[PDB]
Design a protein around this ligand. Structure first.
Ligand SMILES: CC(C)CCC[C@@H](C)[C@H]1CC[C@H]2[C@@H]3CC=C4C[C@@H](O)CC[C@]4(C)[C@H]3CC[C@]12C
Ligand SMILES: CC(C)CCC[C@@H](C)[C@H]1CC[C@H]2[C@@H]3CC=C4C[C@@H](O)CC[C@]4(C)[C@H]3CC[C@]12C
Lengths: 222, 179, 101, 181, 101
């Protein structure tokens, strides 16, 4: 009843979630080098004051509902096998700052999944190869990177994101359309070969190539 | 009229919120950083004998009032900024959203540039800045100007006029053959 | 409270007719509020233009009258004419039963 | 990774002394300013779960020691910078004048960018900075992004016209052989 | 100095095998030197590689023994086992005129 931390890592044989039916005062719970596939649903019924929750290197199939527990600050669920995210995963969850989901099997994120959370500062959904990405309620994050999402081709709306500063999109065609530099730094830099406004660039050179194709064929047929 | 990139930081994890403003031609335009210290327009007068001093380095926020409210202002708008830099400030941020004439008051006084940047934030963007200076207990302000690229628009004139020069000569060659 | 402008960010920026104008600083914001009398450790300064409540520079003083005339000195000193003296010269008692030289 | 004209301020009056240093790829190059607070190479460790905290915003000066002196450093050079930013720093000035290999240590940290600038000052120009951190009681460091003005999109504009002159002139000599035939 | 390396700008970087290493920062410069004992309000922590004189975290403690055990408490609190309590439980001497319990 006084335990604060519990950091198990490298426990590469345990395949069941530990029994915590009496520990209700821990701050950070970490099971990193594990093999855990079933987080019990009855989690927020206890541990009512944790401010960290790390379960990275352990194959997790799905997630429970974090209904309540509005003291949770950071989460990290990497390297898992989370195929889907339901809408009730983040009900409430005030003062949640960082949320990573990198390197999983996410392919569909429900639209109403980020509308209830508090002021998230960072949110990384990377290398998941999803198809669509809802932006409802993400109007407060300062860094959001989606790199290994080559299946995602949709262009993100810049109206929702207001105070965003760092953005890493799969293709360099969302960052340019985002119209950054409010100044926004984007890792997949569009450079010069990949434009957003005009393919030919300035209006001077366009007037030049307009003459080339106009004459390269009118005389050629003769 | 060069844009100013000013953002505020909140130590606790540091949430960052940014906003845009326009530099003014009264102080040498360059980047600066410091703590936000709100200063009342009437507190930056000069006839005062002795006043309490702040630690060196602080971005002062001054929300200007209506010009008709003050019939005999103690100092000019440029005088306010010059006093603050002497006081120990490093970058004065104004708020001309209520006194639009201050922009002319600053840009006219180009005879004696100031050593430190001076910024004016107008419109509804200053409302967000005031909502931060009103609520948060400690803030950290940085102002920066980093315009990259322009690098093809500059060479566009050289590439475009060259083709016209090439074509006008070909025009005369066709003209002179038939005549 | 009670002034002419009273803008929501600078407080009240013009006293009424005969009240003192005092700049209250807390945290970052410095809102100007208008008072009847200088609160403490300040000395009122009347003026036909604007009544400014200024700060005392006299050493070891809790409440003053002029720029250099302390009315109620600190508990660790005694006042002879206007100053706050630790040593009480002759002709007057060191404390006079009232912390007064 | 251009130069960085870091200048220090010595107030009460304001005397300014500047010096030049090189930006590093460990963190994004920007402009920052704060009180200069020296740290120690061994003071930026991580095992100490409880350390004294400073106010937010301070340019830390780290005088790097010889790499062979310590048998096993606790953290990498690019790890010290990341630890310092967590302490609430805005910039770090790694005096690498004694550990030359540290420059490569930072320059290989392009895998994970850092949110704040990182500078290294080598040579005898760092002696001036060290004398300031030694003698004066309080100073203020001030670093600015791209201190010079490089006309990147202005100097090359007229180069294209000179490029076109060669194209326009190489064709003229061809007519000489036409006339000789 | 106390240690061996002791660079003239950074302090004594690597101390000896049986002395402590305390980082004394005043003003701006921070440097360290070999010490035989932790000065005050610190607790020595020996290690097979480098003896670190770490800082205490127990409140109202002027001199400690470990990160949690306080040896001499503050002048306003008496100590019962290793803590600095203000209340002395029953069955023990109240203060014994020596700030204990
Ligand atoms: C660097 C740039 C501006 C140089 C431009 C050079 C131009 C003006 C020169 C280069 C080659 C020239 C042509 C070379 C040969 C002939 C054939 C002759 O029967 C009529 C004139 C004509 C058609 C010349 C006209 C002027 C010309 C087109
Ligand atoms: C600078 C580049 C882009 C210009 C491209 C067009 C150049 C190659 C053209 C423009 C005018 C042309 C000339 C026009 C007329 C004649 C006269 C003829 O008896 C021989 C060829 C000659 C001499 C041409 C050579 C090629 C020429 C110089």
């Amino acid at each position: 009843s006084d335990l604060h931390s519990l950091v198990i890592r490298g426990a590469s044989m345990v395949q069941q979630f530990p029994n915590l039916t009496g520990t209700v005062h821990l701050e950070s719970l970490t099971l990193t080098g594990t093999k855990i596939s079933s987080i019990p649903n009855n989690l927020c019924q206890e541990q009512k004051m944790l401010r960290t929750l790390d379960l990275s290197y352990n194959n997790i199939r799905d997630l429970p509902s974090f209904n309540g527990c509005h003291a949770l600050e950071e989460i990290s669920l990497q390297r898992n096998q989370i195929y889907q995210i339901k809408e009730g995963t983040f009900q409430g969850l005030i003062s949640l700052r960082i949320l990573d989901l990198s390197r999983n099997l996410i392919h569909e994120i429900h639209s109403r999944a980020f509308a209830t959370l508090g002021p998230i500062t960072n949110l990384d959904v990377s290398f998941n190869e999803l198809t669509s990405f809802p932006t409802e309620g993400l109007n407060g994050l300062n860094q959001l990177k989606l790199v290994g999402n080559f299946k995602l081709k949709e262009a993100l709306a810049a109206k929702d994101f207001v105070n965003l500063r760092s953005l890493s999109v799969p293709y360099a065609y969302q960052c340019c359309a985002f119209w950054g530099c409010i100044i926004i730094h984007c890792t997949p830099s569009t450079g010069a070969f990949k434009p957003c406004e005009y393919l030919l660039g300035s209006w001077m050179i366009r007037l030049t190539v307009w003459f080339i194709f106009l004459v390269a064929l009118f005389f050629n047929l003769l | 009229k060069e844009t100013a990139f000013v953002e505020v930081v909140l130590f606790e994890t540091t949430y960052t919120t940014g906003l845009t403003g326009r530099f003014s031609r009264a102080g040498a335009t360059l980047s600066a950083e410091g703590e936000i210290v709100q200063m009342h327009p009437l507190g930056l007068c000069n006839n005062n004998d002795e006043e309490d001093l702040y630690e060196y380095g602080w971005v002062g926020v001054v929300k200007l009032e209506q010009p008709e409210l003050d019939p005999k202002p103690c100092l000019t708008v440029l005088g306010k900024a010059k006093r603050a830099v002497q006081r120990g400030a490093t970058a004065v941020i104004f708020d001309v959203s209520e006194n639009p004439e201050a922009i002319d008051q600053l840009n006219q006084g180009s005879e004696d540039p100031l050593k430190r940047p001076v910024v004016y934030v107008k419109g509804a963007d200053a409302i967000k800045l005031m909502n931060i200076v009103n609520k948060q207990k400690v803030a950290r302000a940085r102002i920066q100007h980093r315009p990259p690229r322009q690098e093809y628009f500059d060479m566009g004139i050289f590439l475009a006029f060259f083709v016209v020069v090439s074509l006008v000569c070909l025009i005369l060659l066709v003209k002179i053959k038939l005549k | 409270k009670g002034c002419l402008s009273c803008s929501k960010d600078n407080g009240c920026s013009r006293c009424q007719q005969k009240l003192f104008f005092f700049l209250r600083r807390e945290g970052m914001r410095q809102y100007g509020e208008c008072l009847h009398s200088c609160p403490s450790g300040y000395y009122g300064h009347r003026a036909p233009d604007m009544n400014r409540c200024a700060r005392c520079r006299i050493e070891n003083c809790d409440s003053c009258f002029s720029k250099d005339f302390c009315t109620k000195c600190k508990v660790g000193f005694y006042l002879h004419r206007g100053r706050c003296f630790d040593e009480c010269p002759a002709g007057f008692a060191p404390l006079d039963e009232t912390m007064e030289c």
